[PDB]
Each structure stands twice: as C-alpha cells, then as structure tokens.
Design a protein around this ligand. Structure first.
Ligand SMILES: Nc1ncnc2c1ncn2[C@@H]1O[C@H](CSCC[C@H](N)C(=O)O)[C@@H](O)[C@H]1O
Ligand SMILES: [Zn+2]
Ligand SMILES: [Zn+2]
Ligand SMILES: [Zn+2]
Lengths: 428, 7
C-alpha cells in the first residue's frame, strides 16, 4: 500500500547512511521495522512480557527455565521459536543470568539461519553492519573477548562449535557489531524495557540535532520525521540522551561508536552552560548519586528511587537550580517514582519543575518531552487545575501527534482528556 | 548502556 520513501546511500565520510527520496513533513512515518532479534533487558526481566514487552499485572513463568515470563499463552507460543534454544541455556545458567548482549546475540545466530529473508534486513543485513573493528581500542577488544567466552559457555548446551553456525558469522565481530548497532527498546512512555537489532534502521547516522526520531510499539520500531526534510537530505537520529554535555556526548560517541561528532551543537558547546548551572562542587555529588538512582529505576525499584531522590532534592533546594541537568534528572526520577507509588500531588510538585528545562533541552518535537508534558498535564487535571492542564494537554498533543503519530493510543487518551478538561473550563 | 538511547 505504502511507497518506500528512504534509500541507503554512500556518504563522504560516515560510511553508509539513509536519505529521503521524496520530500518529508514532520510526523511522516518513514519506516516500520521488526527486530532481527530482541530480548527483555536485565532490569525488566520479570516486569514486562518477554514477547510483547508490555507491563502486565501478572505474568506466567516458562515452566522449564522459570526465567522467561509471558502475559498469556498466545505470547508464550509466539515466542517459543525465539526461546527454544535459550531455555535450556537460561535454566542451566541459574542462579546466573547472562549479559543482555550475550542473550541478544544468542537469538541472532538462529535468525541468521532462516530461509525466510528478514523483513528487518531489507535495506541492510546483519553482515553489512559496521563493526568498527579497525578502530577498537585494546580495552574494548579485551571486553569483547570476554563476551565471546561468556557466549561460548552460555550457549554450550546448543552450540559446541563454529561449524554449527554460518561460515560468514564470526563471534568476535558479532559482538563488536552488537555494541554499536543495538537499540534500546522503550515502551510508549519512553521507559527502557529491552534491546534489539534492527539492521535496516542501523543505516541512520547520528546527529545531536536530528531530523528524525524513533518510538516503539512493543518490539516494533517506528521511524518518523520530526522536521521538514528535502529529497536527498540525509536522515539522522540522535544516538544519545539529550541531557548530556558536549563533553559527555563526545566521550560516549568515542567509546561506543568510534567517532567524533562534528554536528554544529558539538562545535559550539550548545547549551553546555545551562546544563551546568550551579557550582561543580555541589552538582558533582548529584552526578555521582545518579549512577545508583538510575540502576534502581532500570529495576523498577520505585520506593528506593524516591528515597534517594528526596534526600538529594531536599538538601540542594537552596543552592542548585533545577535547570542543572543532574538535578533535573533527579526530579524526573522522583516524579516517575511518585506516579508509580500513587503519590500524585507530590509527582505534580517534581513534575512541574522539569517543564521549563525540558522545553529548553528538548527542542522542537521530541517524544521524551511530549510524554513529560503529557504526564504533568494529567497530574494537573487530577488536581483540578484545569486551565493549566488544558495548556499542557494541548501541547503534548501537538508534540506527540508528530512523534507518536495520530493513530497512537496515547493520542486517543489525550483527546478524551482535552475534552473533559475543556468542558470543566467552560463550566467554570 | 547497551543500545542507542531515544532521548
Ligand atoms: N555523525 C557521524 N559522524 C561520523 N560517523 C558516524 C556518525 N554517525 C554514525 N557514524 C558511524 O556509523 C556507525 C553507526 S552505524 C550507522 C551507519 C554506518 N555509517 C554504516 O555504514 O553502517 C558509527 O560507529 C560510526 O562509525
Ligand atoms: Zn505478551
Ligand atoms: Zn524457558
Ligand atoms: Zn554533535
């Protein structure tokens, strides 16, 4: 039904890339892709369905390994192909659990042996993926070697030798490819729930100011334009969190992707000054604490996250502004924690404080901001603060119709809320 | 963190 509006091409210096073959407007869906392979990530193991990656109140463990959990038999049956070979591996590893990259690659090798050409590889295959093999530092090669051994041990029940996989496949190279090509999979409210490989989507080079963005529906990846784009214009996404200083961005791009970004934001340290508002002596502590805090959120430990956040927020109220990114991230965690713990009034407290900083650091239309605004607007609505909510709901609608698309369930809710809210306002 | 971020 739908014309393909993107194509692979060779760039001057970034290797291959993806570009528009037709003019594109904001919100326009460019690509829908299934994973070559994917898995729930460590922190969400028993929290979301192994298959559809949805959070369901109550999940059924696979009777054999008791590691994989599903929201229904339909999901358990749909997953058995992808699960067959790991089930034994997982059961035996117990009480151990392998790194995600190991479990992920474990699913990949079997997909590689399909005869049904992968829909996820229509533009680019696993074997085309960049490994950056010649640019890896010795520290990295070492860690990769370890992953290789861990794989050999983890898969030993199913694979004993190289001849049981395709001749072109190489473990060391596979892991290198995995580090720089895997996508973290997020639910609709941009919470991290998994990781996957989407080889065709892997063509997109990075920019700290991208013209496209990505949102998932379960393991399905949707790529959209968030900006007007011209024929022949390279399509880009941002590989990184938006709340990072030019220097943090440089380091992670170096360490994980073996390149330095020359985008205009990196040239000019764009917003670095705002991000670091406050005294380094103070906000350094906050940056440190964030390590533990975010590891806790990855494991959905909301009580624990709230406590750490409260101590930090309380203690800094007199000397550190909310626009400082480390402090901002602590507020964002605090809010999410309160929302999950039914502390709604208090969520509104922390949430309102992220609003202006988010508008600044998440320019334009970004799914992360769209969802933030949506949450605050809903919290407002809940507290009866109608004209405030209405303003925010309207704004979330405007952002998310572009980042999530009109057919999205979250847009459905928004419209209903805008209506209930607009009613109470013109009844006031 | 394994895998590209989304924001
Ligand atoms: N903005 C950028 N500048 C230079 N290289 C980039 C870049 N964004 C991505 N890359 C390169 O692309 C890799 C990510 S995979 C992106 C597609 C890749 N260029 C390819 O031909 O398969 C990175 O490891 C880096 O080598
Ligand atoms: Zn399911
Ligand atoms: Zn099992
Ligand atoms: Zn940049």
């Amino acid at each position: 039904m739908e014309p393909l509006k993107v194509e692979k091409f060779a760039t001057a210096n970034r290797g291959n890339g993806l570009r528009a073959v037709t003019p594109l407007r904001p919100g326009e869906l460019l690509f829908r892709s299934d994973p070559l392979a994917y898995t729930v990530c460590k922190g969400s193991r028993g929290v979301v369905c192994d298959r559809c990656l949805l959070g369901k109140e109550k999940l059924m463990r696979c009777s054999q390994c008791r590691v994989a959990k599903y929201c229904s038999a339909k999901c358990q049956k749909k997953a058995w192909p992808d699960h067959k070979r790991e089930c034994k591996c997982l059961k035996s590893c117990k009480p151990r659990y392998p790194p995600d990259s190991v479990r992920l690659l474990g699913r990949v090798v079997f997909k590689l042996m399909d005869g049904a050409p992968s829909e996820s590889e229509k533009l680019y295959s696993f074997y085309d993926l960049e490994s950056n093999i010649n640019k890896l530092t010795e520290d990295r090669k070492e860690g990769l070697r370890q992953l290789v051994m861990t794989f050999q041990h983890f898969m030993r029940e199913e694979i004993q030798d190289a001849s049981q996989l395709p001749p072109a496949f190489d473990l060391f190279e596979a892991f290198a490819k995995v580090i720089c090509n895997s996508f973290t999979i997020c639910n609709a409210e941009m919470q991290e729930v998994g990781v996957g490989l989407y080889p065709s989507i892997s063509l997109l080079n990075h920019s700290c100011d991208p013209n496209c963005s990505i949102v998932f529906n379960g393991p399905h990846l949707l790529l959209r334009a968030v900006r007007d784009i011209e024929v022949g214009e390279e399509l880009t996404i941002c590989y990184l969190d938006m709340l990072m200083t030019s220097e943090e961005r440089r380091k992670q791009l170096r360490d994980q992707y073996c390149f330095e970004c020359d985008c205009f934001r990196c040239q000019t340290q764009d917003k670095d000054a705002d991000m670091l508002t406050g005294d380094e002596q103070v906000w350094k502590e906050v940056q440190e604490s964030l390590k533990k805090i975010e590891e806790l959120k990855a494991h959905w430990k909301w009580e624990q996250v709230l406590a750490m956040c409260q101590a930090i927020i309380s203690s800094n109220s007199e000397r550190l502004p909310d626009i400082n990114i480390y402090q901002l991230k602590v507020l964002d965690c605090a809010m999410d924690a309160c929302i999950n713990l039914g502390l709604l009034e208090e969520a509104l407290f922390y949430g309102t404080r992220t609003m202006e900083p988010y508008r600044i650091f998440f320019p334009g239309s970004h799914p992360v901001r769209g969802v933030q605004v949506m949450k605050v607007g809903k919290l407002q609505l809940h507290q009866g603060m109608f004209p405030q909510a209405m303003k925010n709901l309207r704004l979330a609608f405007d952002i998310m119709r572009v980042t999530h698309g009109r057919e999205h369930s979250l847009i459905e809710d928004l419209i209903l809320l805008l209506e209930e809210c607009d009613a109470n306002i013109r009844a006031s | 963190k394994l895998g590209k971020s989304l924001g």
